[PDB]
DNA sequence: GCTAATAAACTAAAAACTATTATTATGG
DNA sequence: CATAATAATAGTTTTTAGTTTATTGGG
């Protein structure tokens, strides 16, 4: 499901973030503010297609095209991007704060039923597919009914209009976090993290869409419609868009297919592919390339069921792609493949194919891992349904080792490693990897986006240590390496 | 190496599986004895490799041995 | 005494995400 | 020939697919 996850950032003018308020920080401001921009970060690397706009609720002298009083509106509905970081950093750390003072101040009245007013018509600004809308806010006012009654009454309208719009409104910690103590009463229409909001962990891309989407055709008689889809990415460099070194402006790289004699723009019709051979240039063409890729059509043509005990380590290839089952129009695909999930303790046989991946190109050997309805107790669906495509292996698939077939060693020294393996057992984190190139990459990126001084190297988990380890186990795995001239030469 | 053979997993079309050896001419068969009392002694590394049948060389590229260098 | 065998990067790339317009059916 | 007919034939940014890029190499 495409969609723009809007999201709006209310942030107090008066006092909220000029007031300790049962806490000892300076103002929340910068705070705020230094956490809005890392998220604005994290989206930057991690997510540009949802829309940002940031509101001060509260306003001594109104920036607002609604014009309404108390309004103060910076950042307009829109993806992350440079021009707001420049606009926050105006509002960034302690001298942002006196310039807040300067143009606008604080102390600012508010207007609460208005700012609802105005942030709703932001949302009725947008165009475009809309994922989610979310309003987010920090106040140290946890609870200021206080207010007159009209305006309360009135705000708890307009967000029971709002969340009956559908739109989404976050109060987070800023007064006595934790014990549900923050939002004494406005707790009454909302029903911690900024660690995280300040953490802006970034560089996250995953699917949006559907797609890629086949059909089993497992006989020459039947077709279950499948879906193909992947959670396992290589992380790409960034598109190098060629801009004019002085003027930033894109090139036109023109390039074509020509002639080094006479001067004539070629094409593929008047060449033809070629493959110089012993005494003989064999000529193809581009359609008879094609052809010579062209072996079916796409989709899923069973060849058969193996258990899932001839796969081994040296029985792997590229990573694995996954099949869920689809009924667009193959009836019952998720029915039998329910049948073959409840009946996969005995399908430990699973499918055999020699998958096709679209036209014009040949099929390939893959096997499918029968993926299981692997719903966690949190309703997190670990594995979907279906099933992973781990892919078969041709004598292509081959590049030979040598054969001095090495011999075990004494039992003694096998007890003594296992016991430091299991003792310097490193604490299982899937989510743990993040590339060195790529986090400095993204440091780089976004410190060479503004004048920062330099950009952080990300010390990353993927860091082996000298010590951690030699701290954890010791230098009794080097002491347990007894032999002469252990391979430390 | 004998003009004919020397001496589901049906899946479809797979090499040839012999040829006749035995009741083929009786010049034949001397000449095959022969050189078989010489195969026990020399059976050589071309049908070590692979046994040269007129079966086994149709179907596929086993010939063509699939396999790039060493890293 | 010599001289690849690679593999950082190639430089790309075929995927429906979306669908208005024509569809030629029926008021005219 | 009548004239608002309202389906397919793409429009899309898709990630993801083969790109020479690279150095140890026989003397």
Redesign the pocket.
């Known amino acids: 499901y ?1 969609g723009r996850d809007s999201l709006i950032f209310l942030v107090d003018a008066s006092k909220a973030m000029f007031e300790s308020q049962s806490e000892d920080e300076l103002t929340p401001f910068d705070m705020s503010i230094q956490c809005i921009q890392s998220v604005y970060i994290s989206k930057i690397i991690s997510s540009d297609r949802d829309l940002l706009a940031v509101v001060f609720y509260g306003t001594e002298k109104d920036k607002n095209s609604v014009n309404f009083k108390n309004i103060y509106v910076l950042q307009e509905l829109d993806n992350p991007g440079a021009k707001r970081i420049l606009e926050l950093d105006q509002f960034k750390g302690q001298q942002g704060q006196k310039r807040f003072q300067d143009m606008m101040g604080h102390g600012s009245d508010y207007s609460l039923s208005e700012v609802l007013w105005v942030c709703a018509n932001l949302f009725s600004d947008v165009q475009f597919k809309m994922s989610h809308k979310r309003i987010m806010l920090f106040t140290n006012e946890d609870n200021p009914h206080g207010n007159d009654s009209a305006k309360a009454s009135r705000a708890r309208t307009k967000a029971g209009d709002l969340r009956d719009t559908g739109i989404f409104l976050d109060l987070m910690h800023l007064k006595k976090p934790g014990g549900f103590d923050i939002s004494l009463f406005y707790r009454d229409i909302i029903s911690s993290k900024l660690e995280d909001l300040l953490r802006k962990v970034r560089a996250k891309e995953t ?1 949006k ?5 086949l059909k089993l055709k497992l006989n020459k008689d039947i077709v279950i419609s499948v879906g193909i889809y ?1 959670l396992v ?2 992380a790409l ?1 960034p598109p ?1 868009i060629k801009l004019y070194r002085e003027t930033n402006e894109p090139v036109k790289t023109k ?1 074509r297919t020509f002639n080094t004699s006479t001067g004539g723009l070629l094409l593929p019709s008047d060449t033809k592919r070629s493959q110089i051979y012993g005494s003989r240039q064999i000529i193809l063409e581009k359609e008879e390339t094609e052809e010579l890729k062209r072996f079916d059509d796409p989709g899923l043509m069973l060849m058969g069921f193996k258990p899932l005990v001839l796969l081994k380590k040296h029985h792997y290839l590229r990573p694995s792609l996954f099949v869920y089952p689809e009924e667009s129009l193959v009836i019952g695909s998720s029915t039998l493949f329910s049948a073959l999930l409840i009946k996969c303790l005995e399908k430990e046989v699973a499918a055999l194919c020699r998958y096709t991946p ?1 036209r014009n190109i040949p099929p390939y050997f893959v096997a499918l891992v029968p993926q299981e309805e692997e719903l966690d107790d949190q309703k997190i669906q670990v594995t979907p349904p279906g099933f992973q495509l781990v892919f078969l292996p041709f004598a292509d698939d081959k590049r030979k080792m040598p054969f001095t077939e090495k011999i075990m060693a004494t039992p003694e020294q096998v007890g003594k490693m296992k016991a430091i393996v299991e003792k310097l057992r490193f604490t299982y984190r899937s989510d743990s990897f993040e590339n060195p190139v790529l986090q400095q990459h993204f440091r780089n990126l976004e410190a060479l986006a503004l004048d920062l001084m330099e950009p952080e190297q990300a010390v990353d988990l993927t860091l082996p240590k000298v010590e951690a380890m030699n701290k954890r186990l010791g230098s009794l795995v080097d002491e347990f390496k007894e032999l002469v001239y252990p391979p430390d030469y | 190496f004998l003009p004919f053979s020397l001496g589901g997993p049906f899946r479809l079309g797979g090499h040839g599986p012999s040829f006749p050896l035995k009741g083929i001419t009786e010049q034949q068969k001397e000449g095959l004895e022969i050189v078989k009392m010489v195969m026990i002694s020399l059976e050589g590394e071309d049908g070590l490799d692979e046994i040269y049948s007129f079966s086994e060389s149709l179907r596929k590229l086993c010939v063509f041995k699939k396999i790039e ?1 060493h ?1």
């Open positions: 495409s699917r869409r559907a797609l890629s989407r992947n990415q290589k460099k190098p390039t679209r | 260098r890293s």
